[PDB]
Symmetry: C3
């Protein structure tokens, strides 16, 4: 395990996701409100899935070698397995907060699936120049998602409770900033142009992942917006 | 890319799915009705997914070699990845049109999953005679789906709005004819008996795919059946 | 096929799932009640999926070799493909019976996904001692599911119809006993410590699978709890 310099960040990531999972699990024990239960379920599952995939990367299972540029390049494929399930759960948290219509939710989840799926294909593609074609398609799917979060959701939040409108606005802003960093790190890291070494890349993704999951969850689950308006 | 004679049909397929995706995306921009949004979301996602998988076939990612009959046989596995997601979306379009009950929808999607999954296993099976066992099981799942579309849905459409009944009937008929061709092409093509060469097989699937997705979508999204009855 | 001593149990399993599938399919033909249709759909799909995966194991497709302990160890990976889809369907049968809230259903299905997914990783892991780390995480996800079935569902059933409360209690008890055997068989069988040989392991899983699917389904589909209260 320690044979890879990036192991320290995989281990820290595993620990922080594990701790985040346990914290949300305990916190949600005292919850009976049916609406709050939905948000706790979604939000606890996110770091639990990430915990398993960080562990698989730490132990070496979630790593494969991909030939491109005349080299055997270490590619952590387990990231995409994580993201396939956790990024639509994160979007679902946002969509339920603002009572999004079903068509909009399906558009978001579908675009998200395309985003992660094409990122996976790009990560595993052996023809170097083609990796960036997949990156571009994935990034276009991301831009669609960000567009919807701003010009379909923000003006939906404003007709809702003030506490859900303010909580949505904060989580929207956190999401757009954090999620936009992922394609940049991929592009300059070992999957793309290879300018930033894998150990630093792994650190960067770990900070983004913990912030986008445990950070996000801490903000959401401390808000009164997750509860039905009750006396 | 041009090293494979079937590349021209993969390229045309990619282009037509891409163009179809953009057309539906633009067309649905001016839509606020919650019901119509569902149909636009579902129907736009279908060629978008197909676009990505056609591209993966064009670039060579979605192709593998399978030993059977003492030969290395080129198998485009990306078709099944496409179909796994797009065929239940197509069925969902039909089921929502007639306000199908939840049990019926689950039966359809489940049978569809079995249909595509067993087709994939058959496509990748190395014992030649066993490929046709999987083809038979998949075809039985197809026949179940077609049965339900006729003797569970058609008489559901007739108690609904005339515009939804007439639109459903047309899309049902398009679906049954087009979908029934797929097992025949598989059986006589490079996956099955090998009587029709891969380049012609690829052409045939491209015509079926564009018709079943973009053709289907053009009929559906031009109907007033996708809108709630409103003043 | 007969080259593997466990083939007889794979063949019997295939037959019993096939027969169970046909029986439930015929039985549900005379059903119009929308609630009952849901239970028939879910419950018929379960042995149908299991039939396909038992067949893939019989024909040899669903088997791979995994190096650990200095040996090539036969691992039937198709079990996890089965279980990935059938165990959440089984939980859905239980959850719908007691009209579980959406948050609880998502927690169950999510924990179940983690349970099966980590079992799959453990089954395919090449470092022997690490296989048991994945077994432990999977078992913890199982224990969560069993906890919810007892201390979240049982007291939900009691405020419902007596026929649904009594049917739920029986199916809950069947589920907890049968499902708890699976991690034990894995641990002592060819995936784990290797004390029980593969042919006996295969027998054990076949008895558990038929009981947990066809047995379970026979109890559920003969109950009046699956019908809406109607005059
Ligand atoms: C009911 O609605 C609220 C339940 O949501 C909360 C439900 C949770 C989503 C349940 C899912 C967590 C499972 C219990 C997962 C089990 C293994 C976990 C990964 C635990 C890992 C952390 C520990 C090992 C440090
Ligand atoms: C509604 C939304 C969910 C829409 C989803 C959007 C989605 C369509 C976007 C594209 C997804 C698609 C790229 C998934 C591809 C998975 C694939 C990378 C798995 C690895 O297999 C690739 C090659 C080795 O590189 O296998 C070597 C050759 C092997 C023989 C491969 C044969 C097995 C195939 C992988 C079977 C395909 C199954 C499905 C792709 C399962 C989807 C997995 C998940 C990653 C989407
Ligand atoms: C809101 O409900 C309506 C939105 O549906 C319409 C929503 C669409 C389903 C959004 C999904 C499309 C994504 C934007 C996919 C991005 C890449 C596409 C494959 C674009 C490819 C076509 C172009 C490259 C020729
Ligand atoms: C409700 C509905 C959805 C019901 C669904 C119906 C469904 C049950 C029908 C059968 C689906 C099942 C056949 C999927 C099999 C996928 C498999 C072909 C992927 C390729 O792996 C096959 C061999 C190489 O040929 O791998 C070589 C050996 C490797 C070590 C394989 C180990 C990895 C396994 C593939 C893990 C299994 C994961 C699940 C099958 C994911 C499902 C993928 C999708 C195609 C259904
Ligand atoms: C409508 O709601 C009730 C339908 O549920 C019942 C619907 C069923 C879930 C339909 C799914 C079964 C498909 C017809 C599967 C076809 C192949 C089967 C595996 C048949 C195998 C058994 C036989 C070959 C012995
Ligand atoms: C809401 C709930 C559903 C939550 C779900 C919980 C879930 C997160 C729990 C963990 C699931 C995760 C372990 C699935 C891993 C599948 C993996 C074993 C498939 C086989 O690939 C493993 C190695 C060979 O051993 O591939 C060799 C290297 C290859 C290059 C691998 C590259 C292809 C990757 C497999 C692509 C990943 C796609 C997704 C994992 C699809 C999920 C399949 C299913 C088994 C969950
Ligand atoms: C918890 C993990 C999260 C929130 C991950 C988010 C990841 C993305 C938004 C990834 C986006 C990518 C692209 C837009 C193109 C390049 C490849 C990706 C997959 C890194
Ligand atoms: C957009 C793509 C569509 C509508 C594809 C439909 C495909 C089928 C109905 C495929 C059916 C098959 C069988 C019935 C058995 C042989 C294998 C298949 C998968 C080709
Ligand atoms: C129809 C099949 C059923 C009901 C299978 C149930 C399987 C399980 C509950 C498996 C549990 C496992 C663990 C808890 C850890 C070890 C690995 C598994 C996957 C066997
Ligand atoms: C969105 C953030 C992307 C920028 C990442 C900056 C990383 C700077 C680290 C120094 C680069 C290491 C190069 C020498 C090894
Ligand atoms: C459902 C349509 C299946 C029939 C396809 C007919 C294809 C005819 C093309 C000629 C066959 C090529 C054989 C000589 C290369
Ligand atoms: C939950 C049941 C697990 C116990 C399984 C008992 C199997 C006993 C069979 C005898 C073991 C075979 C060892 C000699 C080959
Ligand atoms: C490819 C995996 C996509 C599914 C991820 C799980 C999250 C799905 C959330 C469903 C949202 C509800 C839509 C109506
Ligand atoms: C194996 C992939 C199956 C899922 C495909 C996505 C479409 C699912 C549509 C869900 C229909 C709603 C059922 C209640
Ligand atoms: C990884 C596969 C998980 C999906 C299995 C299919 C069963 C899903 C049942 C959905 C229950 C409804 C939740 C709201
Ligand atoms: C186009 C929608 C406006 C809100 C999205 C902001 C786009 C940020 C760009 C992210 C950088 C990705 C490379
Ligand atoms: C049995 C249901 C009647 C409607 C379905 C028509 C079946 C068409 C056969 C398709 C050919 C597949 C090989
Ligand atoms: C902790 C919840 C109480 C009900 C679950 C009973 C646990 C049975 C243990 C199963 C054995 C697995 C190794
Ligand atoms: C070796 C790099 C070749 C450049 C490929 C860039 C493709 C980016 C596509 C953006 C439309
Ligand atoms: C080499 C071909 C052997 C014939 C197999 C046909 C099987 C079809 C099954 C239909 C019930
Ligand atoms: C070779 C076996 C080494 C023992 C591993 C047991 C790990 C079990 C983890 C339970 C917390
Ligand atoms: C990680 C295993 C958890 C089993 C005990 C249940 C914890 C309490 C959860 C309350 C919903
Ligand atoms: C509760 C702490 C969980 C941390 C387990 C994984 C950390 C890796 C240590 C090497
Ligand atoms: C908008 C046109 C999209 C076409 C891109 C793929 C066509 C392949 C050209 C070689
Ligand atoms: C209807 C009987 C189904 C049995 C088919 C599979 C049994 C395997 C026989 C070798
Ligand atoms: C993006 C950083 C999130 C910070 C989380 C802090 C949570 C405290 C309530
Ligand atoms: C099956 C062929 C479909 C033809 C689509 C034409 C759409 C015009 C409205
Ligand atoms: C766990 C054993 C189940 C027994 C099923 C018998 C069904 C008869 C109604
Ligand atoms: C990591 C366990 C958290 C302890 C409880 C925190 C207050 C709910
Ligand atoms: C008003 C919300 C500001 C949140 C910005 C957080 C940036 C990481
Ligand atoms: C809305 C601001 C987006 C900031 C992008 C930051 C990418 C590192
Ligand atoms: C391909 C872009 C379509 C242009 C608009 C067509 C009329 C909505
Ligand atoms: C009355 C509907 C006829 C549609 C037939 C289309 C055949 C491709
Ligand atoms: C309902 C008519 C079906 C026609 C099947 C055509 C197969 C090529
Ligand atoms: C296996 C076929 C079952 C025959 C009908 C049983 C009574 C519904
Ligand atoms: C009162 C229900 C008892 C069911 C026990 C079944 C054990 C297999
Ligand atoms: C509730 C009793 C569980 C029995 C476990 C049996 C495991 C073989």
């Amino acid at each position: 395990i320690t044979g890879r310099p990036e192991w320290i960040w995989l281990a820290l990531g595993t620990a922080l996701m594990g701790l985040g999972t346990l914290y949300f699990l305990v916190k949600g024990m005292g919850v009976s409100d049916p609406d709050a239960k939905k948000f706790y379920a979604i939000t606890t599952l996110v770091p639990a899935i990430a915990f398993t995939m960080y562990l698989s990367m730490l132990l070496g299972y979630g790593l494969t070698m991909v030939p491109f540029g005349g080299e055997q390049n270490p590619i952590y494929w387990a990231r995409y397995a994580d993201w396939l399930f956790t990024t639509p759960l994160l979007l679902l948290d946002l969509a339920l907060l603002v009572d999004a219509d079903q068509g909009t939710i399906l558009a978001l989840v579908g675009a998200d699936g395309i985003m992660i799926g094409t990122g996976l294909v790009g990560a595993l593609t052996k023809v170097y120049s083609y990796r960036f074609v997949w990156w571009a398609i994935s990034t276009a799917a991301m831009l669609y998602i960000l567009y919807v979060l701003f010009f379909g959701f923000t003006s939906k939040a404003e007709s809702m409770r003030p506490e859900v409108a303010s909580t949505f606005k904060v989580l929207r802003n956190v999401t757009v900033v954090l999620w936009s960093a992922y394609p940049v790190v991929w592009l300059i890291g070992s999957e793309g142009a290879g300018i930033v070494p894998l150990n630093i890349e792994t650190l960067l993704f770990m900070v983004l992942d913990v912030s986008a999951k445990v950070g996000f969850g801490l903000i959401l689950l401390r808000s009164r917006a997750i509860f039905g308006e009750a006396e």
